[PDB]
Amino acid sequence: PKEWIPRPPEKYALSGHRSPVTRVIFHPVFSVMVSASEDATIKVWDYETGDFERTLKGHTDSVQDISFDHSGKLLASCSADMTIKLWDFQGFECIRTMHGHDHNVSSVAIMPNGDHIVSASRDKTIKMWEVQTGYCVKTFTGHREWVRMVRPNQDGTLIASCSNDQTVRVWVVATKECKAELREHEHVVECISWAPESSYSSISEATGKPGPFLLSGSRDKTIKMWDVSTGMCLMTLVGHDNWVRGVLFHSGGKFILSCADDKTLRVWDYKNKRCMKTLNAHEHFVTSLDFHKTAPYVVTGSVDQTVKVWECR
């Protein structure tokens, strides 16, 4: 389970979206994954059987991001319609629509404890929302441009964000203080991902409580690994031929996976600071990926309007 990597050809290529797929995520428990699209819909699929299950309709523009709560009974989505929606993922109904952003909401995440949602917008702000009320309880200001992605760390004490202002910021959720401003990308930063604890010994081996550690992917075509405790870039992974769109760690901690506008899914052996495998994943940009925590599956989404399921071995 700590060594398996995606292998071509894809197990499934799933069609049905009428516009680019913007985001793909696995359910935390069920054999389903969820896609968001510029067609203003969210679709649910079984990644074991390839069966289409249902469409969640209600956004009036592009759905940009999606996030499950711990329980898997709530799904948050966000949209170019400038709203966040909370969905009952049992009854498949919109519970509430949250208003407050003044432009495109590019990113959403339900915080780990499940009591709050964090969002990031082209309006240059990050907002915190109460799940129960939909009330905006916090606005994090300081990015100089469009905030493209926001992600909490494992216990929800920190959020990381990235921006058209060419920076990654780390914020303390409780105080709103900016812990780190990471500036080494000289281009728009598209994506970020926190390192899991399973990676810490491998990151120690590669460099020779630690961290925490963060990945960023940029229009400069590189992935950077950061030590949030020192503000230092530990390594830069070179190999993508176009803008990096998604990054994450293998749940086993020993590999990084990424996807990009070069139509590839890549597996990085980061101890060797090298690209170990390139998959020709899609006929157009790969906008998004997810890695199942325990099952041998990766999912990708693309401008080619498909969701692909990759078996890992």
Side-chain angles (χ1 to χ4, degrees), residues 143-153 155-182 184-196 198-206:
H143 275 299
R144 292 176 290 280
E145 301 295 351
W146 190 345
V147 193
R148 306 194 72 80
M149 191 172 293
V150 62
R151 300 285 177 251
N153 71 339
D155 67 4
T157 53
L158 304 178
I159 52 165
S161 57
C162 63
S163 169
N164 285 65
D165 72 11
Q166 310 189 351
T167 75
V168 174
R169 284 179 158 233
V170 177
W171 320 72
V172 182
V173 167
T175 72
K176 300 204 304 162
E177 78 196 62
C178 185
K179 182 175 177 66
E181 182 175 332
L182 310 172
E184 200 167 279
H185 292 293
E186 293 175 66
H187 214 325
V188 175
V189 183
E190 283 285 9
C191 58
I192 48 166
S193 192
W194 290 95
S198 64
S199 72
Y200 280 20
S201 67
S202 287
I203 295 170
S204 177
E205 287 168 357

Short mmCIF file of all heavy atoms in Angstrom, two decimals, residues 143-206, unseen atoms left out:
data_model
loop_
_atom_site.label_atom_id
_atom_site.label_comp_id
_atom_site.label_asym_id
_atom_site.label_seq_id
_atom_site.Cartn_x
_atom_site.Cartn_y
_atom_site.Cartn_z
N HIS A 143 -3.28 38.72 0.93
CA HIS A 143 -2.91 38.42 -0.47
C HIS A 143 -3.16 39.68 -1.30
O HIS A 143 -4.16 40.39 -1.04
CB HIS A 143 -3.64 37.21 -1.05
CG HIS A 143 -3.00 35.90 -0.73
ND1 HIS A 143 -1.72 35.60 -1.13
CD2 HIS A 143 -3.48 34.81 -0.09
CE1 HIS A 143 -1.43 34.36 -0.76
NE2 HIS A 143 -2.50 33.86 -0.12
N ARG A 144 -2.30 39.92 -2.29
CA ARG A 144 -2.35 41.14 -3.14
C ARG A 144 -3.16 40.88 -4.41
O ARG A 144 -3.49 41.85 -5.10
CB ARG A 144 -0.93 41.64 -3.43
CG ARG A 144 -0.22 42.17 -2.20
CD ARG A 144 1.22 42.58 -2.44
NE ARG A 144 2.08 41.44 -2.71
CZ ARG A 144 2.60 40.62 -1.79
NH1 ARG A 144 2.36 40.81 -0.50
NH2 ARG A 144 3.36 39.61 -2.17
N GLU A 145 -3.45 39.61 -4.74
CA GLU A 145 -4.26 39.23 -5.92
C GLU A 145 -5.13 38.02 -5.56
O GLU A 145 -5.00 37.49 -4.43
CB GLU A 145 -3.37 38.95 -7.13
CG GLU A 145 -2.49 40.11 -7.57
CD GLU A 145 -3.20 41.35 -8.10
OE1 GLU A 145 -4.43 41.32 -8.31
OE2 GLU A 145 -2.49 42.36 -8.30
N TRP A 146 -6.01 37.66 -6.48
CA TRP A 146 -6.78 36.39 -6.56
C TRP A 146 -6.13 35.28 -5.73
O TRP A 146 -4.96 34.91 -6.00
CB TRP A 146 -6.85 36.02 -8.04
CG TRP A 146 -7.76 34.90 -8.44
CD1 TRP A 146 -8.37 33.94 -7.67
CD2 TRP A 146 -8.13 34.61 -9.80
NE1 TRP A 146 -9.12 33.11 -8.46
CE2 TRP A 146 -8.98 33.48 -9.77
CE3 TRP A 146 -7.83 35.21 -11.02
CZ2 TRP A 146 -9.52 32.93 -10.93
CZ3 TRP A 146 -8.37 34.67 -12.17
CH2 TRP A 146 -9.20 33.55 -12.12
N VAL A 147 -6.88 34.75 -4.77
CA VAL A 147 -6.48 33.55 -3.97
C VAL A 147 -7.09 32.32 -4.65
O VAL A 147 -8.33 32.25 -4.75
CB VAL A 147 -6.92 33.69 -2.50
CG1 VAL A 147 -6.26 32.63 -1.64
CG2 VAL A 147 -6.62 35.08 -1.96
N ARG A 148 -6.23 31.43 -5.14
CA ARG A 148 -6.62 30.32 -6.04
C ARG A 148 -6.91 29.04 -5.26
O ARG A 148 -7.69 28.23 -5.77
CB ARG A 148 -5.54 30.07 -7.09
CG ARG A 148 -5.16 31.31 -7.87
CD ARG A 148 -4.36 30.97 -9.11
NE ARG A 148 -5.16 30.33 -10.13
CZ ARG A 148 -5.97 30.96 -10.98
NH1 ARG A 148 -6.08 32.27 -10.98
NH2 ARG A 148 -6.68 30.26 -11.85
N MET A 149 -6.32 28.85 -4.09
CA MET A 149 -6.52 27.58 -3.35
C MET A 149 -6.29 27.84 -1.87
O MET A 149 -5.43 28.67 -1.53
CB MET A 149 -5.59 26.47 -3.87
CG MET A 149 -5.96 25.09 -3.31
SD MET A 149 -5.07 23.69 -4.02
CE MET A 149 -5.72 23.75 -5.69
N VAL A 150 -7.07 27.18 -1.02
CA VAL A 150 -6.86 27.24 0.44
C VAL A 150 -7.05 25.83 1.01
O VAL A 150 -8.00 25.16 0.64
CB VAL A 150 -7.77 28.29 1.11
CG1 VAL A 150 -9.25 28.00 0.94
CG2 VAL A 150 -7.41 28.42 2.58
N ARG A 151 -6.18 25.43 1.92
CA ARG A 151 -6.21 24.06 2.47
C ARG A 151 -5.80 24.09 3.93
O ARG A 151 -4.77 24.66 4.28
CB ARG A 151 -5.26 23.13 1.72
CG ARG A 151 -5.58 22.98 0.24
CD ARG A 151 -6.78 22.11 0.00
NE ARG A 151 -7.19 21.98 -1.39
CZ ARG A 151 -8.28 22.51 -1.95
NH1 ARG A 151 -9.10 23.29 -1.25
NH2 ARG A 151 -8.55 22.28 -3.22
N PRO A 152 -6.59 23.47 4.83
CA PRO A 152 -6.19 23.34 6.23
C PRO A 152 -5.17 22.23 6.43
O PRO A 152 -5.14 21.27 5.66
CB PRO A 152 -7.48 22.91 6.92
CG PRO A 152 -8.23 22.14 5.86
CD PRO A 152 -7.90 22.85 4.56
N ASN A 153 -4.35 22.37 7.46
CA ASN A 153 -3.44 21.28 7.90
C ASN A 153 -4.28 20.24 8.65
O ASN A 153 -5.49 20.41 8.77
CB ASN A 153 -2.26 21.82 8.72
CG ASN A 153 -2.67 22.31 10.09
OD1 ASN A 153 -3.83 22.63 10.33
ND2 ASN A 153 -1.71 22.38 11.00
N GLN A 154 -3.65 19.18 9.11
CA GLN A 154 -4.37 17.97 9.57
C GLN A 154 -5.26 18.27 10.79
O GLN A 154 -6.34 17.69 10.86
CB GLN A 154 -3.41 16.81 9.85
CG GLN A 154 -2.32 17.15 10.85
N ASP A 155 -4.84 19.14 11.71
CA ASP A 155 -5.65 19.42 12.93
C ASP A 155 -6.41 20.75 12.77
O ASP A 155 -7.12 21.14 13.72
CB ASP A 155 -4.79 19.36 14.19
CG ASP A 155 -3.75 20.46 14.30
OD1 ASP A 155 -3.72 21.34 13.42
OD2 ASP A 155 -2.98 20.42 15.28
N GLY A 156 -6.30 21.41 11.61
CA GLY A 156 -7.06 22.64 11.30
C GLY A 156 -6.55 23.88 12.03
O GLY A 156 -7.24 24.91 11.98
N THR A 157 -5.36 23.83 12.63
CA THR A 157 -4.78 25.01 13.33
C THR A 157 -4.20 26.00 12.31
O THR A 157 -4.12 27.20 12.63
CB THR A 157 -3.72 24.62 14.36
OG1 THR A 157 -2.72 23.79 13.76
CG2 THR A 157 -4.31 23.93 15.58
N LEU A 158 -3.78 25.52 11.14
CA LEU A 158 -3.19 26.36 10.07
C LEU A 158 -4.00 26.20 8.79
O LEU A 158 -4.56 25.10 8.55
CB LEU A 158 -1.74 25.95 9.79
CG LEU A 158 -0.78 25.96 10.98
CD1 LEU A 158 0.58 25.48 10.54
CD2 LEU A 158 -0.69 27.34 11.60
N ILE A 159 -4.04 27.26 7.99
CA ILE A 159 -4.45 27.14 6.57
C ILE A 159 -3.29 27.63 5.70
O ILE A 159 -2.56 28.58 6.08
CB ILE A 159 -5.76 27.91 6.29
CG1 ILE A 159 -5.68 29.36 6.78
CG2 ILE A 159 -6.94 27.15 6.88
CD1 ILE A 159 -6.76 30.26 6.23
N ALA A 160 -3.14 27.01 4.54
CA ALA A 160 -2.20 27.45 3.50
C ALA A 160 -3.01 27.94 2.31
O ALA A 160 -4.04 27.34 2.01
CB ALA A 160 -1.27 26.34 3.11
N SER A 161 -2.55 28.99 1.67
CA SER A 161 -3.24 29.56 0.49
C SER A 161 -2.21 29.91 -0.56
O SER A 161 -1.03 30.09 -0.21
CB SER A 161 -4.07 30.77 0.86
OG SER A 161 -3.27 31.77 1.48
N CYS A 162 -2.63 30.02 -1.80
CA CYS A 162 -1.73 30.46 -2.88
C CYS A 162 -2.48 31.38 -3.82
O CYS A 162 -3.71 31.36 -3.84
CB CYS A 162 -1.14 29.26 -3.60
SG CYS A 162 -2.36 28.23 -4.44
N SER A 163 -1.74 32.19 -4.56
CA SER A 163 -2.32 33.38 -5.21
C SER A 163 -1.63 33.73 -6.53
O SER A 163 -0.46 33.38 -6.75
CB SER A 163 -2.28 34.51 -4.21
OG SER A 163 -2.58 35.79 -4.77
N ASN A 164 -2.36 34.48 -7.36
CA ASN A 164 -1.79 35.21 -8.52
C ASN A 164 -0.70 36.18 -8.07
O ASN A 164 0.10 36.56 -8.93
CB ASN A 164 -2.88 35.95 -9.28
CG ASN A 164 -3.73 35.01 -10.11
OD1 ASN A 164 -4.44 34.17 -9.56
ND2 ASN A 164 -3.67 35.16 -11.42
N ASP A 165 -0.63 36.56 -6.78
CA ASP A 165 0.45 37.46 -6.27
C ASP A 165 1.78 36.71 -6.15
O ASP A 165 2.74 37.30 -5.64
CB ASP A 165 0.04 38.13 -4.95
CG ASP A 165 0.00 37.23 -3.72
OD1 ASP A 165 0.50 36.08 -3.81
OD2 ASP A 165 -0.50 37.70 -2.69
N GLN A 166 1.84 35.45 -6.60
CA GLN A 166 3.08 34.63 -6.75
C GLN A 166 3.57 34.11 -5.39
O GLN A 166 4.73 33.69 -5.31
CB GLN A 166 4.16 35.42 -7.50
CG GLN A 166 3.68 36.06 -8.79
CD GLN A 166 4.80 36.64 -9.61
OE1 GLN A 166 5.95 36.72 -9.17
NE2 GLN A 166 4.48 37.05 -10.83
N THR A 167 2.72 34.12 -4.37
CA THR A 167 3.11 33.67 -3.02
C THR A 167 2.22 32.52 -2.55
O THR A 167 1.07 32.38 -3.03
CB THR A 167 3.09 34.81 -2.00
OG1 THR A 167 1.74 35.13 -1.65
CG2 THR A 167 3.85 36.03 -2.49
N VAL A 168 2.77 31.78 -1.61
CA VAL A 168 2.04 30.87 -0.69
C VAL A 168 2.03 31.55 0.67
O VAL A 168 3.11 32.00 1.13
CB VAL A 168 2.69 29.49 -0.63
CG1 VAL A 168 2.04 28.60 0.42
CG2 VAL A 168 2.69 28.83 -2.00
N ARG A 169 0.87 31.63 1.30
CA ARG A 169 0.79 32.12 2.69
C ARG A 169 0.36 30.99 3.60
O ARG A 169 -0.44 30.12 3.18
CB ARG A 169 -0.16 33.31 2.82
CG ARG A 169 0.46 34.60 2.31
CD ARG A 169 -0.51 35.75 2.43
NE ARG A 169 0.26 36.97 2.42
CZ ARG A 169 0.20 37.95 3.33
NH1 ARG A 169 -0.68 37.92 4.32
NH2 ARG A 169 0.98 39.00 3.19
N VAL A 170 0.90 30.96 4.81
CA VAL A 170 0.39 30.09 5.89
C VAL A 170 -0.15 31.00 6.98
O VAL A 170 0.55 31.96 7.36
CB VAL A 170 1.48 29.13 6.41
CG1 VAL A 170 0.97 28.28 7.57
CG2 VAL A 170 2.01 28.27 5.27
N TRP A 171 -1.37 30.73 7.41
CA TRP A 171 -2.07 31.56 8.41
C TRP A 171 -2.40 30.69 9.62
O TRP A 171 -2.79 29.52 9.45
CB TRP A 171 -3.36 32.17 7.85
CG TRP A 171 -3.33 32.69 6.45
CD1 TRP A 171 -3.29 31.95 5.29
CD2 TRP A 171 -3.51 34.05 6.02
NE1 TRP A 171 -3.39 32.76 4.20
CE2 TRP A 171 -3.53 34.06 4.61
CE3 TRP A 171 -3.65 35.27 6.70
CZ2 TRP A 171 -3.71 35.23 3.87
CZ3 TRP A 171 -3.81 36.43 5.97
CH2 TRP A 171 -3.83 36.41 4.57
N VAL A 172 -2.31 31.28 10.81
CA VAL A 172 -2.83 30.66 12.05
C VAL A 172 -4.33 30.94 12.09
O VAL A 172 -4.73 32.11 12.09
CB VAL A 172 -2.10 31.17 13.30
CG1 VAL A 172 -2.61 30.48 14.55
CG2 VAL A 172 -0.59 31.00 13.17
N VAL A 173 -5.15 29.90 12.10
CA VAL A 173 -6.63 30.05 12.03
C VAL A 173 -7.13 30.86 13.24
O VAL A 173 -7.96 31.75 13.03
CB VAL A 173 -7.32 28.68 11.90
CG1 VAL A 173 -8.82 28.76 12.13
CG2 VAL A 173 -7.01 28.04 10.56
N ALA A 174 -6.63 30.58 14.45
CA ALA A 174 -7.14 31.17 15.71
C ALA A 174 -6.88 32.69 15.74
O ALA A 174 -7.74 33.42 16.27
CB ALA A 174 -6.52 30.49 16.90
N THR A 175 -5.74 33.16 15.23
CA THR A 175 -5.27 34.56 15.40
C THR A 175 -5.34 35.34 14.08
O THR A 175 -5.25 36.57 14.12
CB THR A 175 -3.83 34.62 15.94
OG1 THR A 175 -2.98 34.22 14.87
CG2 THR A 175 -3.59 33.74 17.14
N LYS A 176 -5.49 34.64 12.95
CA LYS A 176 -5.41 35.19 11.57
C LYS A 176 -4.00 35.67 11.23
O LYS A 176 -3.82 36.24 10.14
CB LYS A 176 -6.37 36.37 11.34
CG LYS A 176 -7.85 36.06 11.55
CD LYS A 176 -8.75 37.00 10.78
CE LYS A 176 -8.50 38.46 11.09
NZ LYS A 176 -9.07 39.35 10.06
N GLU A 177 -3.01 35.45 12.09
CA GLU A 177 -1.64 35.94 11.78
C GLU A 177 -1.11 35.16 10.57
O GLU A 177 -1.39 33.95 10.43
CB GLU A 177 -0.70 35.84 12.98
CG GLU A 177 -0.17 34.46 13.25
CD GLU A 177 0.43 34.34 14.64
OE1 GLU A 177 -0.33 34.53 15.62
OE2 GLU A 177 1.65 34.04 14.73
N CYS A 178 -0.34 35.85 9.75
CA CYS A 178 0.42 35.24 8.63
C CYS A 178 1.73 34.69 9.18
O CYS A 178 2.66 35.49 9.44
CB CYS A 178 0.65 36.24 7.51
SG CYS A 178 1.45 35.43 6.11
N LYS A 179 1.78 33.37 9.37
CA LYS A 179 2.95 32.62 9.89
C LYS A 179 4.10 32.66 8.87
O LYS A 179 5.26 32.79 9.29
CB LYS A 179 2.56 31.18 10.18
CG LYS A 179 3.67 30.31 10.76
CD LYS A 179 3.19 28.93 11.14
CE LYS A 179 4.29 28.03 11.65
NZ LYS A 179 4.86 28.52 12.93
N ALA A 180 3.81 32.51 7.58
CA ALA A 180 4.84 32.45 6.53
C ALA A 180 4.28 33.04 5.23
O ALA A 180 3.09 32.82 4.94
CB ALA A 180 5.31 31.04 6.33
N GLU A 181 5.12 33.76 4.50
CA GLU A 181 4.87 34.20 3.11
C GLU A 181 6.02 33.64 2.28
O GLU A 181 7.17 34.11 2.47
CB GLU A 181 4.73 35.72 3.01
CG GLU A 181 4.43 36.22 1.60
CD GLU A 181 4.16 37.71 1.45
OE1 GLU A 181 3.70 38.33 2.43
OE2 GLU A 181 4.39 38.25 0.35
N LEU A 182 5.74 32.65 1.45
CA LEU A 182 6.76 31.86 0.69
C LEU A 182 6.79 32.40 -0.74
O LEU A 182 5.77 32.30 -1.43
CB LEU A 182 6.37 30.38 0.77
CG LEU A 182 6.08 29.86 2.18
CD1 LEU A 182 5.52 28.45 2.15
CD2 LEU A 182 7.32 29.92 3.06
N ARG A 183 7.92 32.97 -1.19
CA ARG A 183 7.94 33.92 -2.34
C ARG A 183 8.75 33.43 -3.55
O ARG A 183 8.79 34.18 -4.55
CB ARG A 183 8.54 35.25 -1.87
CG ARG A 183 7.62 36.06 -0.97
CD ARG A 183 8.13 37.48 -0.82
NE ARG A 183 7.67 38.07 0.42
N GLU A 184 9.32 32.23 -3.52
CA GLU A 184 10.38 31.80 -4.47
C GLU A 184 9.82 31.53 -5.88
O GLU A 184 10.59 31.66 -6.86
CB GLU A 184 11.08 30.56 -3.92
CG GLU A 184 12.44 30.30 -4.51
CD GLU A 184 13.21 29.26 -3.72
OE1 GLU A 184 13.81 29.62 -2.67
OE2 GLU A 184 13.21 28.10 -4.14
N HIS A 185 8.56 31.12 -6.03
CA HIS A 185 7.94 31.03 -7.38
C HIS A 185 7.88 32.45 -7.94
O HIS A 185 7.34 33.33 -7.26
CB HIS A 185 6.53 30.41 -7.36
CG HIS A 185 6.44 28.96 -6.99
ND1 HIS A 185 6.93 27.94 -7.78
CD2 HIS A 185 5.84 28.36 -5.93
CE1 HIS A 185 6.64 26.77 -7.23
NE2 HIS A 185 5.97 27.01 -6.10
N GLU A 186 8.37 32.68 -9.16
CA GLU A 186 8.28 34.03 -9.79
C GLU A 186 7.15 33.97 -10.82
O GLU A 186 7.32 34.46 -11.94
CB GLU A 186 9.64 34.44 -10.35
CG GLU A 186 10.68 34.67 -9.27
CD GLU A 186 12.08 34.96 -9.79
OE1 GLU A 186 12.26 36.02 -10.42
OE2 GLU A 186 12.98 34.12 -9.55
N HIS A 187 6.03 33.36 -10.43
CA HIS A 187 4.85 33.20 -11.30
C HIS A 187 3.66 32.89 -10.41
O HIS A 187 3.83 32.60 -9.21
CB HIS A 187 5.09 32.10 -12.34
CG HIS A 187 4.45 32.30 -13.67
ND1 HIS A 187 3.22 32.93 -13.83
CD2 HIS A 187 4.84 31.91 -14.90
CE1 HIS A 187 2.90 32.93 -15.11
NE2 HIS A 187 3.86 32.30 -15.78
N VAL A 188 2.47 32.93 -10.99
CA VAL A 188 1.22 32.53 -10.30
C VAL A 188 1.41 31.15 -9.66
O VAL A 188 1.97 30.24 -10.28
CB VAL A 188 0.04 32.50 -11.28
CG1 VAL A 188 -1.23 31.98 -10.61
CG2 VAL A 188 -0.18 33.89 -11.88
N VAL A 189 0.96 31.01 -8.42
CA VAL A 189 0.94 29.69 -7.73
C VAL A 189 -0.49 29.15 -7.81
O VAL A 189 -1.42 29.85 -7.39
CB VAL A 189 1.46 29.78 -6.30
CG1 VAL A 189 1.51 28.40 -5.66
CG2 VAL A 189 2.84 30.44 -6.27
N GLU A 190 -0.63 27.94 -8.37
CA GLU A 190 -1.95 27.35 -8.70
C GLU A 190 -2.46 26.48 -7.55
O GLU A 190 -3.67 26.39 -7.36
CB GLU A 190 -1.82 26.49 -9.95
CG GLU A 190 -1.75 27.30 -11.24
CD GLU A 190 -3.07 27.89 -11.69
OE1 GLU A 190 -4.07 27.82 -10.93
OE2 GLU A 190 -3.10 28.43 -12.80
N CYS A 191 -1.57 25.75 -6.89
CA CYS A 191 -1.99 24.66 -5.99
C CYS A 191 -1.02 24.49 -4.84
O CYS A 191 0.15 24.85 -4.94
CB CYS A 191 -2.18 23.36 -6.75
SG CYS A 191 -0.71 22.77 -7.64
N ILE A 192 -1.55 23.92 -3.77
CA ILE A 192 -0.80 23.60 -2.53
C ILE A 192 -1.33 22.28 -1.97
O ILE A 192 -2.49 21.92 -2.26
CB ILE A 192 -0.98 24.73 -1.52
CG1 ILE A 192 -2.47 25.08 -1.42
CG2 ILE A 192 -0.14 25.94 -1.89
CD1 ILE A 192 -2.84 25.92 -0.26
N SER A 193 -0.52 21.65 -1.14
CA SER A 193 -0.91 20.42 -0.40
C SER A 193 0.00 20.27 0.81
O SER A 193 1.20 20.49 0.70
CB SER A 193 -0.82 19.22 -1.29
OG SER A 193 -1.45 18.10 -0.68
N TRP A 194 -0.59 19.91 1.94
CA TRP A 194 0.17 19.64 3.18
C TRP A 194 0.79 18.25 3.14
O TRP A 194 0.15 17.29 2.67
CB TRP A 194 -0.74 19.77 4.40
CG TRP A 194 -1.17 21.17 4.70
CD1 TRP A 194 -2.32 21.78 4.29
CD2 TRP A 194 -0.44 22.14 5.46
NE1 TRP A 194 -2.36 23.06 4.75
CE2 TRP A 194 -1.23 23.31 5.48
CE3 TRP A 194 0.77 22.13 6.15
CZ2 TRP A 194 -0.83 24.46 6.16
CZ3 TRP A 194 1.17 23.27 6.81
CH2 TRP A 194 0.37 24.42 6.82
N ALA A 195 1.98 18.13 3.69
CA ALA A 195 2.64 16.81 3.84
C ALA A 195 1.97 16.03 4.95
O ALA A 195 1.78 16.56 6.05
CB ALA A 195 4.10 16.99 4.14
N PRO A 196 1.64 14.74 4.74
CA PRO A 196 1.15 13.88 5.82
C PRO A 196 2.30 13.47 6.75
O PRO A 196 3.45 13.44 6.35
CB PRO A 196 0.59 12.66 5.08
CG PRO A 196 1.45 12.57 3.83
CD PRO A 196 1.74 14.01 3.47
N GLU A 197 1.96 13.07 7.97
CA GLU A 197 2.98 12.61 8.96
C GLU A 197 3.77 11.42 8.39
O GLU A 197 4.97 11.34 8.70
CB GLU A 197 2.32 12.26 10.29
CG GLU A 197 3.32 11.81 11.35
N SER A 198 3.16 10.57 7.57
CA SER A 198 3.81 9.39 6.94
C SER A 198 4.98 9.80 6.04
O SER A 198 5.79 8.92 5.72
CB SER A 198 2.82 8.59 6.15
OG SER A 198 2.32 9.37 5.06
N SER A 199 5.07 11.07 5.63
CA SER A 199 6.14 11.58 4.74
C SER A 199 7.34 12.11 5.54
O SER A 199 8.39 12.32 4.94
CB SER A 199 5.62 12.66 3.82
OG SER A 199 5.38 13.85 4.54
N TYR A 200 7.18 12.35 6.85
CA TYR A 200 8.16 13.15 7.64
C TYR A 200 9.54 12.48 7.62
O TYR A 200 10.53 13.21 7.45
CB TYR A 200 7.63 13.36 9.06
CG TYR A 200 6.61 14.47 9.20
CD1 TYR A 200 5.90 14.95 8.11
CD2 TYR A 200 6.33 15.00 10.45
CE1 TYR A 200 4.96 15.96 8.26
CE2 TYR A 200 5.39 16.01 10.61
CZ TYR A 200 4.70 16.48 9.51
OH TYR A 200 3.78 17.48 9.67
N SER A 201 9.61 11.16 7.79
CA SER A 201 10.90 10.44 7.83
C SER A 201 11.55 10.47 6.44
O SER A 201 12.79 10.65 6.38
CB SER A 201 10.75 9.04 8.37
OG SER A 201 10.00 8.22 7.49
N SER A 202 10.76 10.33 5.37
CA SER A 202 11.24 10.40 3.96
C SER A 202 11.77 11.81 3.67
O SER A 202 12.80 11.92 2.98
CB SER A 202 10.16 10.01 2.98
OG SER A 202 9.91 8.61 3.00
N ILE A 203 11.10 12.85 4.17
CA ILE A 203 11.53 14.26 3.96
C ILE A 203 12.84 14.49 4.74
O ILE A 203 13.74 15.15 4.20
CB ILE A 203 10.41 15.26 4.33
CG1 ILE A 203 9.21 15.11 3.39
CG2 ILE A 203 10.96 16.68 4.34
CD1 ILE A 203 7.98 15.88 3.83
N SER A 204 12.95 13.92 5.95
CA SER A 204 14.20 13.92 6.75
C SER A 204 15.33 13.22 5.98
O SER A 204 16.44 13.80 5.92
CB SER A 204 13.98 13.29 8.10
OG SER A 204 15.20 13.21 8.83
N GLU A 205 15.07 12.04 5.41
CA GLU A 205 16.04 11.24 4.61
C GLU A 205 16.50 12.04 3.38
O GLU A 205 17.70 11.98 3.05
CB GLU A 205 15.43 9.92 4.14
CG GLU A 205 15.26 8.89 5.25
CD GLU A 205 14.40 7.69 4.88
OE1 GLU A 205 13.86 7.67 3.76
OE2 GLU A 205 14.28 6.78 5.73
N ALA A 206 15.57 12.74 2.72
CA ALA A 206 15.81 13.51 1.47
C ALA A 206 16.70 14.72 1.75
O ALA A 206 17.53 15.06 0.89
CB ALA A 206 14.49 13.92 0.87
#
